[PDB]
Write an enzyme that holds these catalytic residues in place. Structure first.
Site, PDB file in Angstrom:
ATOM      1  N   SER B  46     -29.731 -53.051 -61.315  1.00 36.09           N
ATOM      2  CA  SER B  46     -29.009 -54.367 -59.499  1.00 36.09           C
ATOM      3  C   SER B  46     -29.483 -55.601 -60.260  1.00 36.09           C
ATOM      4  CB  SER B  46     -30.430 -54.082 -59.076  1.00 36.09           C
ATOM      5  OG  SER B  46     -31.833 -54.730 -59.336  1.00 36.09           O
ATOM      6  N   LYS B  49     -25.995 -57.515 -60.411  1.00 39.38           N
ATOM      7  CA  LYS B  49     -25.467 -58.267 -59.427  1.00 39.38           C
ATOM      8  C   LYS B  49     -24.916 -59.446 -59.552  1.00 39.38           C
ATOM      9  CE  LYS B  49     -27.794 -56.002 -56.377  1.00 39.38           C
ATOM     10  NZ  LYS B  49     -28.992 -56.678 -56.108  1.00 39.38           N
ATOM     11  N   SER B  94     -27.248 -54.373 -51.721  1.00 41.42           N
ATOM     12  CA  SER B  94     -26.834 -53.638 -53.307  1.00 41.42           C
ATOM     13  C   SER B  94     -26.210 -52.354 -52.735  1.00 41.42           C
ATOM     14  CB  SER B  94     -28.261 -53.254 -54.212  1.00 41.42           C
ATOM     15  OG  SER B  94     -28.032 -52.772 -54.945  1.00 41.42           O
ATOM     16  N   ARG B 219     -42.038 -53.446 -55.782  1.00 40.15           N
ATOM     17  CA  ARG B 219     -41.443 -54.734 -56.461  1.00 40.15           C
ATOM     18  C   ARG B 219     -42.167 -55.850 -55.996  1.00 40.15           C
ATOM     19  NH1 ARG B 219     -35.709 -53.446 -58.010  1.00 40.15           N
ATOM     20  NH2 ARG B 219     -35.989 -52.114 -55.828  1.00 40.15           N
TER      21      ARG B 219
END
Lengths: 232, 234
Positions: B46, B49, B94, B219
């Site tokens: 991810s 991006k 996302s 996270r």
């Protein structure tokens, strides 16, 4: 503009008088609790930081948002003003001296040009170069504030996109999962403002309020926005 | 680059393993709870991006943050992906497909040039043009992430300032009177990252973390427990 008397309650519950102006960018429609007052023009006072800082950036007086303005050593009555600042913190703490130094360096001549270019209020500069937005002759209304902010939002002011981006960065005040708010309170005279906007996923809502100042202001504005489900 | 074992606790409290890397921009000093792992390079997943969206913006594939990417009509398993998006919401949710369409239009050729220019990890592109940051060859570490982000922060990357500004806007995730955070979680197939930074009045603190993904709110919670420890935030 559609008038909504319901919102007066939020002023009244704290024993105060004012106007709140909303503009729904998508629906392209205004709202306000007092139509007349929403066009009553007042001293921009702390809200002048925005055009002031745009102009300073565009004329290279200010290079970027990291450039440091050293504190002159004079101890002023507000503790936060007594340290170095950049464009971001100056806005966050409404550091008047920084914005006066801008105005001086801009000069009366260039400043006048630019305000005519922004179509800022009555575009009047009378007063001291470094005070006129507090002291002098300039006036602007809540609706006139909205038209200005929309231009800014859309990069359609007569300055570089860059200048417009950086000021929009500096206006950042609050952001969480639900919304982003770009708006800065500052020290104001009898009439105190809060102006800026709220970015949502799907839309953006502009606001300009002012009230008679005999600490809420953000508080009242936010009670109106929770009412309109613009935020929780 | 001080190692600080004490932080392992925050991973352990939730029965997980990972690395957190901090960088104090002023003091110009790193910190981390596992020095070795902080240099273990992984799939960006991810976190790609960011370079992806920078490149797209610089090549005019994406005009600006308002440009709409129409949904292709295919109903995917994540509901938020099944609508039109712009750069801002694509980052917020996302939206993988949007970033794949970018990669396709960028093309393998230009993409490779740009990654070499960013000094991005291994700068390896092997895999499918539209998947390689999830499926194949590219790797980058937490420290390599920090060097990249610092460039971005300072407009020191080899793309327009404009491109760098817009991406930094899109990264905005949280901001209040105490701090501003630019960082975006996203779906990571094998390894989960959180990378970005915290702007304070007086300073900016870069971070890159990653952790081993449980069999699926983790996270950011860990990373933030480390930051409260260092008094970077309350």
């Amino acid at each position: 503009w559609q008038e909504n008397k319901s919102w007066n309650a939020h002023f009244t519950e704290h024993k105060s008088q004012g106007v709140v102006v909303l503009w729904n960018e998508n629906k392209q429609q205004g709202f306000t609790n007092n139509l007349k007052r929403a066009n009553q023009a007042f001293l921009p006072a702390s809200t002048f930081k925005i055009p002031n800082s745009l102009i300073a950036l565009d004329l290279g007086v200010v290079k970027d948002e990291h450039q440091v303005f050293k504190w002159d050593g004079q101890t002023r009555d507000i503790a936060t003003w007594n340290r170095d600042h950049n464009l971001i913190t100056a806005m966050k703490y409404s550091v008047v001296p920084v914005y006066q130094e801008f105005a001086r360096q801009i000069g009366e001549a260039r400043m006048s040009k630019m305000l005519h270019a922004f179509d800022y209020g009555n575009e009047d500069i009378s007063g001291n170069v470094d005070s006129f937005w507090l002291d002098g002759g300039i006036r602007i209304s809540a609706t006139e504030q909205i038209s200005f902010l929309r231009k800014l939002y859309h990069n359609k002011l007569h300055v570089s996109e860059r200048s417009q981006r950086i000021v929009k960065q500096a206006m950042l005040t609050e952001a969480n999962g639900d919304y982003i708010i770009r708006a800065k309170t500052g020290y104001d005279t009898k009439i105190g403002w809060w102006v800026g906007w709220v970015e949502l996923d799907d839309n953006v809502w502009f606001f300009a309020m002012n009230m008679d100042m005999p600490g809420l202001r953000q508080a009242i504005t936010k009670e109106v926005l929770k009412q309109e489900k613009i935020i929780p």
